[PDB]
Amino acid sequence: TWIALVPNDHRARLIGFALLAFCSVVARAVGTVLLVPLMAALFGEAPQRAWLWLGWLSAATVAGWVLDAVTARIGIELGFAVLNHTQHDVADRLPVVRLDWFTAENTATARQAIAATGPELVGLVVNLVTPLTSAILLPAVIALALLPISWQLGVAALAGVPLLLGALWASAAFARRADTAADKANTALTERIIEFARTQQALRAARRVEPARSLVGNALASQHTATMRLLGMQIPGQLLFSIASQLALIVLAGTTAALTITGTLTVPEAIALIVVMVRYLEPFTAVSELAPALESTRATLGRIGSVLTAPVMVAGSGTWRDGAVVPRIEFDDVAFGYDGGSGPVLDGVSFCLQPGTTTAIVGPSGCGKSTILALIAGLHQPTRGRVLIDGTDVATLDARAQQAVCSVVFQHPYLFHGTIRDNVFAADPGASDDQFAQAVRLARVDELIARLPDGANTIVGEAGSALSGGERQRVSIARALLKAAPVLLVDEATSALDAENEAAVVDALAADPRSRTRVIVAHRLASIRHADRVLFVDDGRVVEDGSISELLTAGGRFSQFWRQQHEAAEWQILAE
Amino acid sequence: SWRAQAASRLLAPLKLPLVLSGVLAALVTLAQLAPFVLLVELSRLLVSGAGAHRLFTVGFAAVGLLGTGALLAAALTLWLHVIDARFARALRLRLLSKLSRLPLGWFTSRGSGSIKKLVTDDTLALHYLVTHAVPDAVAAVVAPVGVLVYLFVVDWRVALVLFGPVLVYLTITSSLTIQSGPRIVQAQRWAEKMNGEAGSYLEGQPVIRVFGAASSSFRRRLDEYIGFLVAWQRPLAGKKTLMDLATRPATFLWLIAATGTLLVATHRMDPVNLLPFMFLGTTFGARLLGIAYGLGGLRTGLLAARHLQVTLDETELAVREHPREPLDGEAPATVVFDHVTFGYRPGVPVIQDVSLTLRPGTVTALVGPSGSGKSTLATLLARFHDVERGAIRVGGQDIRSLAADELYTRVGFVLQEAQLVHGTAAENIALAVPDAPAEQVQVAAREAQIHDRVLRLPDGYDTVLGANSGLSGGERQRLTIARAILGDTPVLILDEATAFADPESEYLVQQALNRLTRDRTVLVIAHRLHTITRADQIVVLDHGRIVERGTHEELLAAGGRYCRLWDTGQG
């Protein structure tokens, strides 16, 4: 259960830091206990006898200075190491988290965990850890030194550490439990206004905007606002520790003033103890001050535990023995679902793709085809599956052989911030500049770089980069063609307007001599006349397969799709 | 100074309420330092002999102070909520009636998170500013100011010495705030560079799992960032420790003790007057460095108060001009753009004196390169924005002189941005006519080729559509096309990219559009110029104005820009 823990460089340079931060507290306890003989002398008849006890207080202050200086210089270096060792754990964990974890909220959480945790990881040990754990032990060490001096006031000060710490934990629990009701009620209020603004064009164009405004307005106007419940939520979190600390002082000062009247203490040294009781109560107030600084840190570093406890996928040993030949891909009763309330469902898919063949996958929208491709790539695991390639189940391979088998052209092309020729070399960073020469003359991007200001070395991450969505899908085709794995999984782009990106995938299939086993999820019609068997998938199940001579003559689910795709290409908006 | 500004105009009714709040939260924080003033009177009574009856009258005073400081704080914390709930309620009713009046194109210039970031986050930041940040910023200033005034009347000689550790701290902190002139904007550019990097790394996870060497860029941008942080902070450590050792209470305690020992032992101090400093003077550095921390809590509230007041100030669609003259020739469907000019930003025009003219019952296509201004020219007819220089008029009447209901009862548009409302699936097909007998809701969903798909719904037509419904963008589009079929606006604005935005359901969308665009005046934002070759009038335009104009058969004769877009491969 990783949360924000420390590095793995040393253990004797982390246990001698606690023994230093603890001596930095013993120094402050001795500096406070030395006030009894000093103030007891200043209030006596020989006040010049307080020079001896100012000498020792100077000795105890110059020691606390040194101990607080080394404890901070070490706490800064321990924040550096925590930052370094934590930012390298999120970045090493993210490539293993299961892909269905990256929902809309988890992506925001995980991007905050990387982008917005920098400066509060270095400023953690010196800003929150030592000031908090020192202020918590200080009154307990002060109370222990009083027992040789006045055991009544010492015992009454041991009794008060648990009560004053409970009053600090409870007033923070109350203050936190009310601030969640506060931003829950505000959300429950302003989510009708967020909807009224989302569906605005639909309302004004339907002449239905003023009645919908009246509805949201009257509901908003009443809502009962539920306010005083949250008042009762808010008050104790404001009053609890202040009442507790004001009440502990009364008790500790009436105990000291009573031990005088009876004769236990004399007045001079009864005041030296009232001065110490006040100093004993300052750490508790200092802990109450860095309550918001602790809540903000807790929230900000909960996003790191959110990532480090996210579910990871598990891979076997595998060692893809003889990947060489060409793999014969086979599904077996595979059934998949991200979960079961809504999403691309799949169940009963079972085929066998012969090795070295182009296979198209057509069907209704129902994108359990972008899922059939992910199950082959290995990006998703089946729930009742055994996807097995070249005879051997994929889930029984270590994830550096489980990825050395499939080259993929995704649907939405992704390029990272960098030059055009380092996006392509991400596939095979050791390509011998002829693999680069024909990964680009196949992808039809040789012209695109010989028509570009500086061409090849154009930074293409995200600046607009003069590259449109359709020609940013010709560098993905060049990347995927470079990497020489014996499986090519193309997921055609919905992008029209191409006139070149079509011939790109056409030439990727029909021209490439690498001799892999290709599988395309095709929307176009020209990239289906190259496949030698089609898989029509409906409702997450292969309803028919075969070549386009027996599907067409079958007059069934695919001849209709053929006819429709031929008619949806000679369509023209007309007046008539 | 505090005038005529955004946050100053929004937070204008909370002037007397916040003044009373500050006055009441000053007493609340003064009744918490008064116990230490009672402790010094209790000490004086011990010193001065007698007690045991005069020492109960101080405990009575202390419990009275406890009680009256709890009452005052409980009254403040509920005043600050009663007075904030009313403001939030009245401010939501202003945002609700501002959204209904903003120009419609505004909602497209933003996103969907940019609206939540203003309706939820900026209204919660104000609630927190009113209930926490303001009562904390008053205490954070009154406590040290009251302590410093009480300690100077007790003894001015020892209260002067408490400025040693303050001058020593302020010298350092400035010697340090100019060693980070560059690196405090460098670290702000790095913090926004490392955010796009995280976004891209998270968005490109699949690729990174297929091609392992695609994360090298991110993993080397991260070692540069967490190396910059170290090279920035590691220097200025022997300054941050030094300025921290000068505010510790163990430092103030030594000064107080050394200065009080000199004055008492030489008989000029009366040691009962050194007790105020022992009680309240050692924690005096924390208070002065908490002043700034308390004043810095208003920044994130005033930013929200400014972001709300600029939005409540946004110029909204013109009211309407004089219901002027229908210009003598135009049939109820005729549309005339007349010398229109328009630009989003006030100096960069996107349209220049376009003067086309649609006709009743005809199709008209808008071709051009990307970023040419045809989508803008189209949505200018739906009054998404107002035209700066020219004047449009559908049916003979300027669209500026038309009520919002009479404009959309005459101009309809099928763009992208499907936008189904929350409700029954028959409540969306019959949005523009909410009393359709449900036989017309069926005859109109059978024409948009969405009837058999809605019979395959849990309850059928009575299904309550939501964020997750099981409908692709190509069947959420045949719903808004069915709705538009019931609207019957005689002038359609068709975005031709809605057909092929979902390739599977792309032959049924074309059969829905074949019915929606019948017997009416259509204006197509063409993207593929083979669909529009039988349009009545094709119009080319390049980054602004209109270049060429005519039918396809003719426009192909007089070569230029149209033959040049035509023969470009497809032909």
Ligand SMILES: Nc1ncnc2c1ncn2[C@@H]1O[C@H](COP(=O)(O)OP(=O)(O)NP(=O)(O)O)[C@@H](O)[C@H]1O
């Ligand atoms: N909300 C906006 N604010 C400012 N400028 C905008 C906005 N929307 C578009 N523009 C710019 O206005 C110009 C015209 O764009 P647009 O109206 O989309 O032409 P278009 O050709 O119809 N769009 P497209 O064909 O898809 O490229 C371009 O320079 C855009 O970048």
